[model samples]
Target: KCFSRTVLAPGVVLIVQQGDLARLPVDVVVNASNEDLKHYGGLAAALSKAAGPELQADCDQIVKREGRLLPGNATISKAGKLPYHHVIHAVGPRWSGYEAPRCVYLLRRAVQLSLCLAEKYKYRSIAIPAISSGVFGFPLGRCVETIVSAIKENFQFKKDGHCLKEIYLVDVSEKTVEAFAEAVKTVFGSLVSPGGLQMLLVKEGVQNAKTDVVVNSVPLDLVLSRGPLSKSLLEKAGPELQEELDTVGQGVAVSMGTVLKTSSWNLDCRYVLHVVAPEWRNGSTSSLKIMEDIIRECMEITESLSLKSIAFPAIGTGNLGFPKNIFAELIISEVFKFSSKNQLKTLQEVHFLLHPSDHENIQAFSDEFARRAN
Candidate 1:
C-alpha cells in the first residue's frame, strides 16, 4: 500500500510506498548503496538477498570495469530473483553530520543519476527508496524532500521524450512513510494530488466562506429547493438572490453543466455561481458528462468574471447521489483548466465546503481534488 500517490503531470507520478522493494512490480527498483556498490547493509542487503548471486556478480563486473563508484553514481544490473526486471544501485551521501545544502545536493545528484540510468535503459516504472535515510544518517524528511524535489524538478516525460510513467518512492518503515508523505506536502504545495493542482478541502456549510464567489449545486429547475446547499445559500443571501433565482428560472436556458449567477446579499461573497448538477437517475444518468458540465459552467462564469476565489459543496454527491470522487475531480479539473488559459487569470483558490457529516464523501473529494490539482 502507498502512503501517498500523486500525478505531478501527464506522465510523471509521485508515490510513497512502505514495503520490501524486492516485491514491487516495477521495471526497476533502486538500491541505496555506498560508493563501493557492495550489498553489505540496510536496503542493499535486502535487495541483494532478493536478487541472489547473479546480481552480485553483475555488480562485481561493473566494479571491475569502473573501479570504485562515486557517491552520486548509479549502475544498473539484471535482477536475478526479484520481481523487478532490473536493480538500479545509486550511491548516495554518507551523511556523517548535519550540513543541509550539501546533503540535499548529494541526494539530488544520486536520484538524478539513477533517473538518468533509468532513462538510458528506457524503464517505464522505477521504484526508489529513501536514499541515505537509514545507516547513512540522512534525516528522513530532508532526504525525502531532496529526493522528491529532484525527481519532480528534473523528470519531464514529453519534452525530454522519456517513457517513465510511475516513479515509486519505497521504504520499509512506517516512520519513513510518514516522513515521505510530509515531505511531499512541503515540496508540492497541497500534497500534489493526482492531476497536480492546488485544492482546499473544508468540512462545513458553504454559506459563510469569505471568497470572492461561492457555488451552489441546484437542479435544472432552479427552484432554490430544499437541498442543504440551496437552503443555506438562499437563507443567507436574502430576498434579492431569490428574485434573481426566479429571473433565472424564467430564462430556463441554464442546464446542467451551466450556471446562473445572482448577487450576494448579507453574505461575504460577491457573487454565487449556481451550478446545476445532474440529478441522481437511479441507475442511468450520464455520470461523467454531468460532472464535466458542473465544472465547466463554474469555470466559465468564474473565469469570465475574473474572480479570485470560489467555494462549493459536494455538488451532485449529496442530493443527486453522484460519486464524490468523480464530482470532485470534475470540479478540480475545470478550475485547473482555468489556470492553464493564459488569456485570462484571476481565480486563485477553489474551496470545497463539505458538510462535516459527509466525512467519507469529503475524503473522497479531498483525495481526488488534491490529486488533480496541478
Candidate 2:
C-alpha cells in the first residue's frame, strides 16, 4: 500500500505537469537540484543551458560566492536570458542512503523554500524538475512523494490573500513523470475517508475570493487530464478565463461569476480552468447548489474546449466558511454527477487538493469518493 498526499491551493490542487524543453512562459522557474543549490549537473545544467548564458552566468557567480548549500536551502536568481522573471533554486538532498530521512527532508525543504520564495517574489508561475534520483540516487518514487507532500504542506493558494498563481513540476524523464502521475492519483484517490480535512482560516483569500473575476492555480506535473471535454475548452479560450459565474474549487462556474483561465507552462493540458467558489450564506440551502452550479459550468467549458480530464481544489471552506461536511458533500456529489454523465468517473480521474493542515478534509473527500466508486 502507498500513502497519498494532496496539495490545497485556494481553488485547485493538482496542476498540469509538462515535459517541454527550452523555456516556458511562467513567472518563476523552480530548479530541483542538490542541496548545494548550485547550477551544477543533471536537470540544473539543462535548465541553465536552455535559458541561455545570461541565467547560467549569474548562477555560476552565485555558486562561487555561496559554495555548497545545506539540505533544503533555496535561492533566487535573475531571469537573465530565460523567459521567466526569476529562477528559484530549491535544493533537494542527494541520496546518501536508502530510506534516509535526510533525503526526504531535504527534498521537502527545497520545495517549501522554493514556494516561499515564489510567494515573496510575487512570481505567479514557477516550474520544478526532479531533484536527487539520477546521480544523487534518491529513489524516484520517494522523491516524487516527498516533493508532492511538501507542496501540499506548504504552498497554499488562498482566496483569502496569498495571490500567487502557478507552480509546476516539469518532469522530462519518463520515470519521474510516471512517479508524479501516480503520486497524484494516490493523494487524490483517498479523499473520502472519515477525517482528513484542515480548516485553517487564511486571511480573506484563503477560501473565498476577494472578488469574482480573479483567481490563482497550483503546480501539476506532465498531465493532460485526457478526454474530449478538456480539449474543447482549449480550442476556444486558449488558457485564459472563460466563465463569468462564481466558481467553486477551480473550474465550477455558477451563480453569476467570472473565470480566470489557468496559466500554462503545461504542454499536456490544452487548458487549465480556474474559478473562485462563493461562500455559503446563513441557512441558505443554495450554498452547495452554488458550488455545484459553478462546477457544472466548469465542465461545460471543458467540453466546449473538448477536454476530458482535469484537476481541482476544495472551495468555500477556508475563507468562505462553508461547513466541512457541506463542502465535501456538495463538491464530491457534483464531481460524481459530472463524471457519471460524462462517463468519466473513477477512470477519468479528477483531483481534490488540500493542505497538510487540511489532510482531514482531503482524506474525508477521498473516502467518500471511494465509497461512491465502489
Candidate 3:
C-alpha cells in the first residue's frame, strides 16, 4: 500500500529500517557507528554510499584523529558526498547485561550532542534513528521511552533563545514507530498522528509571552500543525490536555503535564514545557491579537487544570515581530488582571525565565509596561 510514504510494522523491536531513513531530510543525520566512526555498516554504509566520497573520507579522518571515543559516545564528520551537511558519529553503548541504563545514556547523550551541534552550526534540521538499538540489545519499551523523554525535556534547546531550528526522529520499522507512538501517547493529553511526523520540525522561542495579559506570537493552528517543537509536546499531551494539570511552570503554554517519574535524572518538575512564540506575519494589531490570545490561552490552560503557580518566560516581541515595548506592556497588564480576577491561591508564584542575551529585550518590556500603566 503506497498510500503512506512509510508504514509502521508493530511489536517490540529496536531495529530502524533502511527504507525509512532514506527519505529523511535533515542537514545532519546521526549514525550510531562504532567508536572508530567508520562507514562499514548498514546505516553508515548506506549514508556513505548515498552521500559520496568526501563524507566517508572525512569520517575516516575523524576516527584517525579522535580515535575510539568511549561507548555511549559520538563523533562528527563532514557528510562527504551526501545531501546532508554533516553526519554525527554517535558511539552507542553495547548492551548492558540486559539492563540498558548505560546504553540509554549513550542514546540520550548522542541526541543531546546532535541538537547542540545543530544549533552551534545552525544546521536548522536533523533526522535521527534509535541509538544502539540496531545491533545493541536494549529493551524495546525502555529504549523508546528514554528517547522520547530526552526529546521532551529539551531545556538545552532554549539556550540561545533559538534552539536547533528543527529536529526529526525517524525509524523505518513499523514496530519502532508503533512503540514511539504508544510511548508518546502515555506521556500526555492526546496522541500525535504519525502523519504529523512528516512535517519538517522547526522550533522558535516562545512567541509572545507576557507578564500580565495574554499576548501570543503565533496562532495555535500554526503551533500545533507547523511549528517544529509542538509535535513532541502535543504527542504527549493527548486526552489529559484538558485534564487537571499535574504541575505548572513559567511558560504558560509549554509545560503542563502530570508528573510521571519525578526522577528523570533528578529534574525538579514533572514535565518541562518548551515555549516558543507564535508566528506573527499579519499587521501589528492582528499580530498583537494572536499574540495576546496565545498567552491568555496558555493561562487559561493553566487555570483549567487549577494549577496554583507556574513560572513563565517573556514571550513574543523577539524575532516573531511584536515590538518589545508594546508586547511587554500588554503581557504584564494581562498577568496582573489574571491574578486579581481569578482569586487563585493555589497558584503560588509565577517566575519569569530570561537568559542574559535577552537583557535589552527585558528592559524595554519592563519600561514599556511601566510607562503605559502610569
Candidate maximizing TM-score: 1
Q: Among these predicted structures, which one has the highest lDDT?
A: 1
Candidate 2 regions with alpha-carbon error over 4 angstroms: 1-7, 35-38, 64-67, 155-160, 189-374
Whose lDDT is higher: candidate 1's or candidate 3's?
Answer: 1
Query: TM-score per candidate, in order?
Result: 0.49, 0.46, 0.44
After TM-score superposition, what is the CA distance of residue 162 in candidate 1 from its true location, in Å?
2.0
Off by over 4 Å in 1: 156-158, 189-374
* Cα lDDT of model 1 by residue, 1-374, tens digit: 78898888786788888888889878888899877778989988988997899888888887877667655557777889888778888888788553444465557767876776788788889888999988888877778888887776554312457678898888878888888888888878142222333467777778888888888877766767578788888888886777887786685687656677887888799988787777644312244445666675675677679786678777787778754543554565555554544344665567778877776667667555443343
TM-score of 1: 0.49
Clashing pairs in 1: 193-370, 193-371, 194-371, 195-371, 195-372, 196-373, 196-374, 197-373, 197-374, 257-293
Whichever of 1 and 2 has more lDDT, that candidate is: 1
Model 3 lDDT tens row, 64-147: 764556554555677766666677776666777533433554566555555555655666556667666777666778776766
- Sequence-dependent TM-score of model 3: 0.44
